[PDB]
Coordinates of C-alpha atoms and ligand atoms in Angstrom, one line a residue:
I1 CA 21.3 -5.1 5.7
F2 CA 22.2 -6.2 2.2
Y3 CA 25.6 -7.8 2.4
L4 CA 24.7 -9.9 5.4
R5 CA 21.3 -11.3 4.1
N6 CA 23.6 -12.1 1.0
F7 CA 26.1 -13.9 3.0
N8 CA 23.2 -15.8 4.5
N9 CA 21.9 -16.7 1.2
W10 CA 25.1 -17.8 0.2
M11 CA 25.5 -19.9 3.4
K12 CA 22.2 -21.8 2.8
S13 CA 23.1 -22.1 -0.9
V14 CA 26.2 -24.0 -0.3
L15 CA 24.5 -26.0 2.5
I16 CA 21.4 -27.1 0.6
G17 CA 23.5 -27.9 -2.4
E18 CA 26.0 -30.2 -0.7
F19 CA 22.8 -32.2 0.9
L20 CA 21.0 -32.6 -2.5
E21 CA 24.3 -34.0 -4.2
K22 CA 24.4 -36.3 -1.0
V23 CA 20.7 -37.3 -1.5
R24 CA 20.9 -37.7 -5.2
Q25 CA 23.8 -40.3 -4.8
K26 CA 21.1 -42.7 -3.6
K27 CA 18.7 -43.2 -6.6
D28 CA 12.0 -37.7 -6.8
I29 CA 13.2 -35.2 -4.3
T30 CA 10.7 -34.1 -1.8
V31 CA 11.5 -31.1 0.7
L32 CA 10.2 -29.7 3.9
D33 CA 10.8 -26.1 4.0
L34 CA 10.0 -25.4 7.9
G35 CA 9.7 -21.7 9.0
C36 CA 9.9 -20.9 5.1
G37 CA 9.3 -17.1 5.5
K38 CA 8.6 -15.2 2.5
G39 CA 10.3 -17.7 0.4
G40 CA 13.9 -16.7 0.5
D41 CA 14.9 -20.4 -0.6
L42 CA 12.3 -21.2 -3.4
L43 CA 15.2 -20.3 -6.0
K44 CA 17.7 -22.7 -4.3
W45 CA 15.2 -25.5 -4.4
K46 CA 14.5 -24.5 -7.9
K47 CA 17.9 -24.6 -9.0
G48 CA 18.6 -27.7 -7.5
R49 CA 15.9 -29.3 -9.4
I50 CA 13.6 -30.8 -6.4
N51 CA 10.4 -32.4 -7.6
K52 CA 8.0 -31.4 -4.5
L53 CA 8.4 -29.0 -1.7
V54 CA 6.1 -28.2 1.4
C55 CA 6.6 -24.7 2.6
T56 CA 5.4 -24.0 6.1
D57 CA 5.5 -20.9 8.6
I58 CA 3.7 -19.6 11.7
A59 CA 3.0 -16.2 9.9
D60 CA 0.2 -16.4 7.4
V61 CA 1.2 -13.1 5.8
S62 CA 4.7 -14.8 5.0
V63 CA 3.2 -18.0 3.7
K64 CA 0.9 -16.2 1.5
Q65 CA 4.0 -13.9 0.2
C66 CA 6.0 -17.3 -0.3
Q67 CA 3.0 -18.7 -2.2
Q68 CA 2.7 -15.5 -4.7
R69 CA 6.6 -15.6 -5.1
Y70 CA 6.3 -19.3 -6.0
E71 CA 3.3 -18.5 -8.6
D72 CA 5.5 -15.5 -10.0
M73 CA 8.5 -18.0 -10.8
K74 CA 5.8 -20.6 -12.2
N75 CA 4.2 -18.0 -14.2
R76 CA 7.5 -16.7 -15.5
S77 CA 9.5 -23.7 -20.4
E78 CA 11.8 -24.6 -17.5
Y79 CA 11.4 -27.1 -14.9
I80 CA 9.7 -26.4 -11.5
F81 CA 8.7 -28.5 -8.5
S82 CA 5.1 -28.6 -7.3
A83 CA 4.4 -26.9 -3.9
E84 CA 2.0 -27.3 -0.8
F85 CA 1.8 -24.1 1.5
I86 CA 0.6 -24.6 5.1
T87 CA 0.2 -22.0 7.9
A88 CA 0.9 -23.6 11.2
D89 CA 2.9 -23.2 14.5
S90 CA 5.5 -26.1 14.1
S91 CA 6.0 -26.0 17.8
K92 CA 2.6 -26.7 18.8
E93 CA 0.9 -28.3 15.7
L94 CA 1.7 -31.7 14.1
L95 CA 2.3 -31.2 10.4
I96 CA 1.3 -35.0 9.7
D97 CA -2.0 -33.9 10.6
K98 CA -1.8 -30.9 8.0
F99 CA -0.2 -32.5 5.1
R100 CA -2.5 -33.6 2.2
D101 CA -0.7 -36.9 2.5
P102 CA -0.3 -37.7 6.3
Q103 CA 2.3 -40.4 5.3
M104 CA 4.4 -38.5 2.8
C105 CA 8.1 -38.6 3.2
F106 CA 10.7 -36.1 2.8
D107 CA 14.2 -36.3 1.5
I108 CA 15.3 -33.1 3.1
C109 CA 14.0 -30.8 6.0
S110 CA 15.5 -27.5 5.8
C111 CA 15.2 -25.5 8.7
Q112 CA 16.9 -22.1 8.3
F113 CA 17.0 -19.6 11.1
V114 CA 14.0 -20.7 12.8
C115 CA 14.9 -23.4 15.6
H116 CA 15.7 -20.9 18.4
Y117 CA 11.9 -19.9 18.3
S118 CA 10.8 -23.6 19.6
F119 CA 13.1 -23.6 22.6
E120 CA 10.6 -21.5 24.6
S121 CA 9.9 -24.9 26.2
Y122 CA 10.5 -28.5 26.0
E123 CA 7.1 -29.5 24.6
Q124 CA 7.7 -26.8 21.9
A125 CA 11.5 -27.9 21.2
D126 CA 10.3 -31.5 20.9
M127 CA 7.2 -30.9 18.6
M128 CA 9.4 -28.7 16.1
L129 CA 12.0 -31.7 16.1
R130 CA 9.4 -34.4 15.5
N131 CA 8.1 -32.3 12.8
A132 CA 11.5 -31.8 11.2
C133 CA 12.3 -35.3 11.6
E134 CA 9.4 -37.9 12.0
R135 CA 8.5 -37.9 8.0
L136 CA 12.3 -38.1 7.0
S137 CA 13.0 -41.1 4.8
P138 CA 15.9 -43.4 5.9
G139 CA 19.0 -41.6 4.7
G140 CA 17.1 -38.2 4.6
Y141 CA 18.3 -35.1 6.0
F142 CA 17.7 -32.4 8.8
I143 CA 19.5 -29.2 8.0
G144 CA 19.5 -25.8 9.5
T145 CA 21.2 -22.8 11.0
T146 CA 20.5 -21.3 14.5
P147 CA 22.6 -19.1 16.8
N148 CA 25.7 -20.7 18.6
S149 CA 24.8 -20.4 22.4
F150 CA 28.6 -20.6 23.1
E151 CA 29.5 -17.4 21.3
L152 CA 26.2 -15.7 22.8
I153 CA 27.3 -16.3 26.2
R154 CA 31.1 -15.7 25.6
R155 CA 29.9 -12.4 24.4
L156 CA 27.3 -11.9 27.5
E157 CA 30.1 -12.7 30.0
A158 CA 32.6 -10.3 28.4
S159 CA 30.0 -7.6 28.7
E160 CA 29.5 -4.9 31.2
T161 CA 25.8 -5.6 30.9
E162 CA 23.1 -7.8 29.7
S163 CA 23.4 -6.5 26.1
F164 CA 26.1 -6.4 23.5
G165 CA 26.6 -5.7 19.7
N166 CA 27.9 -3.3 17.2
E167 CA 26.1 -0.7 14.9
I168 CA 24.7 -3.6 12.7
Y169 CA 23.2 -6.0 15.4
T170 CA 21.8 -5.9 19.2
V171 CA 21.7 -8.9 21.7
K172 CA 19.7 -8.3 24.9
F173 CA 19.4 -11.1 27.2
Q174 CA 16.3 -10.9 29.7
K175 CA 18.6 -12.3 32.5
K176 CA 22.2 -13.0 32.8
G177 CA 24.3 -15.7 34.9
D178 CA 21.0 -18.1 34.6
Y179 CA 20.8 -20.4 31.4
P180 CA 17.9 -22.8 31.6
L181 CA 17.7 -25.4 28.9
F182 CA 14.3 -24.1 27.9
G183 CA 13.0 -20.5 28.2
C184 CA 16.4 -18.9 27.8
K185 CA 15.2 -15.5 26.6
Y186 CA 17.0 -12.8 24.6
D187 CA 16.3 -10.1 22.0
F188 CA 18.2 -10.0 18.6
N189 CA 17.7 -6.8 16.7
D190 CA 12.5 -7.6 16.2
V191 CA 11.2 -10.9 18.0
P192 CA 12.3 -12.8 21.2
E193 CA 14.5 -15.8 20.6
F194 CA 15.5 -18.6 22.9
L195 CA 18.7 -20.2 23.8
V196 CA 19.7 -23.5 21.8
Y197 CA 22.0 -25.6 23.4
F198 CA 23.7 -27.7 20.9
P199 CA 24.4 -30.7 22.9
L200 CA 20.8 -30.8 24.1
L201 CA 19.5 -30.4 20.4
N202 CA 21.7 -33.3 19.3
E203 CA 20.6 -35.5 22.1
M204 CA 17.0 -34.6 21.5
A205 CA 17.1 -35.6 18.1
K206 CA 18.1 -39.3 18.8
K207 CA 14.2 -39.7 20.0
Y208 CA 13.8 -39.5 15.9
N209 CA 16.4 -41.9 15.0
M210 CA 18.9 -39.0 14.1
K211 CA 22.7 -38.9 14.3
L212 CA 24.5 -35.9 13.6
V213 CA 26.5 -35.3 10.5
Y214 CA 28.1 -32.2 11.4
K215 CA 27.8 -29.1 13.4
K216 CA 30.2 -26.2 12.4
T217 CA 30.3 -22.6 13.3
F218 CA 29.7 -20.2 10.4
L219 CA 33.2 -19.2 10.4
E220 CA 34.5 -22.7 10.3
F221 CA 31.8 -23.6 7.6
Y222 CA 32.8 -20.4 5.5
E223 CA 36.7 -21.2 5.6
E224 CA 36.1 -24.9 4.6
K225 CA 33.5 -24.3 1.9
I226 CA 35.4 -21.4 0.3
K227 CA 38.1 -24.0 -0.6
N228 CA 35.4 -25.4 -3.2
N229 CA 36.1 -23.3 -6.2
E230 CA 32.6 -23.3 -7.2
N231 CA 31.3 -22.3 -3.7
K232 CA 33.8 -19.6 -3.9
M233 CA 32.8 -18.3 -7.4
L234 CA 29.2 -18.4 -6.2
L235 CA 30.3 -15.8 -3.1
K236 CA 32.0 -13.7 -5.8
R237 CA 28.8 -13.5 -7.9
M238 CA 26.2 -13.0 -5.1
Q239 CA 28.4 -10.3 -3.2
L240 CA 37.9 -13.0 11.9
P241 CA 38.6 -13.4 8.0
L242 CA 40.1 -10.3 6.4
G243 CA 37.9 -9.5 3.4
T244 CA 34.4 -10.4 1.9
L245 CA 32.9 -8.9 4.8
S246 CA 33.5 -6.0 7.2
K247 CA 34.5 -6.3 10.8
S248 CA 31.2 -5.6 11.9
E249 CA 29.4 -8.1 9.5
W250 CA 31.6 -11.1 10.6
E251 CA 30.7 -10.0 14.1
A252 CA 27.0 -10.3 13.4
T253 CA 27.5 -13.3 11.1
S254 CA 29.8 -15.3 13.6
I255 CA 26.9 -15.6 16.1
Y256 CA 25.4 -18.5 14.2
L257 CA 26.2 -22.0 13.6
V258 CA 25.0 -24.8 10.8
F259 CA 24.0 -28.3 11.6
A260 CA 23.2 -31.5 9.6
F261 CA 21.4 -34.6 11.1
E262 CA 20.6 -37.8 9.3
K263 CA 17.8 -40.3 9.7
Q264 CA 19.1 -43.8 10.4
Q265 CA 18.1 -47.0 8.7
Ligands
SFG301 N1 6.8 -22.1 15.9 C1 7.1 -21.8 14.6 N2 6.5 -22.2 13.5 C2 6.8 -22.0 12.2 N3 7.5 -20.9 11.9 C3 8.1 -20.3 12.8 C4 8.0 -20.5 14.2 N4 8.5 -19.5 14.9 C5 8.9 -18.7 14.0 N5 8.8 -18.9 12.6 C6 9.1 -18.3 11.5 O1 10.6 -18.7 11.3 C7 11.2 -17.8 10.5 C8 12.3 -17.4 11.0 C9 13.5 -16.8 10.2 N6 14.0 -15.9 10.7 C10 13.1 -16.8 8.6 C11 14.0 -17.4 7.7 C12 13.7 -18.2 6.8 N7 13.8 -19.6 6.6 C13 14.9 -17.7 5.8 O2 16.0 -18.3 5.8 O3 14.9 -16.7 4.7 C14 10.2 -16.5 10.5 O4 9.5 -16.8 9.1 C15 9.2 -16.9 11.5 O5 7.9 -16.5 11.1

């Protein structure tokens, strides 16, 4: 369990940091962490020296864990951002209606391992994308990590059943051979997720004046980003390709992709 979560932390680290550098090339960094969980990315924002962060999640128990983690860091002379915490279903509720400041603006929306939950339906996928995008400033960024639908199906079609995996993970599709845009249900060991067809996410984000910066598979992102010595030293410290992970860990990790979109002027 540890090694993978750690590789995923490194992934989000390198992803978050590139877009904070990109952000800062244009003269008070305000960030929306959408589906923030227990606050696994609070330190990344702290290290990035953002000034404001809104943390929101469907699970109140996790948001309260996020809030306590934050109070702990704050309680323990060094700079920390101010933070707003909201328990909401971002696929059914409108965050503009929840913020203290409805007309608040964000420089980044980070959406890490969350989007696949909103694709239960069109209304939900579109709502979570509005929430992510409508308040980004011109030039601001929508960044995330979600399973690559191409790799799920590849592995589905190779399989003798509706299931596949190794000792680390299991995928179990509800149905096989049928891939609707919305509602394409699978299990991933433990909640139900829904297939995210990336061409459809890309297209759908044009409604909120967003152009794709890049989509990379995890393996592609890994091998490009290891070439930066600073990203590589970070991996060194925090810890198919040969080393860094096992065969089985690359197998689990290689399911995912990384994306970045930009609000246009
Ligand atoms: N409709 C929704 N709105 C907001 N959060 C959701 C929704 N559906 C699932 N989630 C949350 O999204 C998160 C899924 C992620 N696996 C947690 C990842 C967390 N951002 C991290 O990178 O550590 C969980 O916290 C779920 O509670």
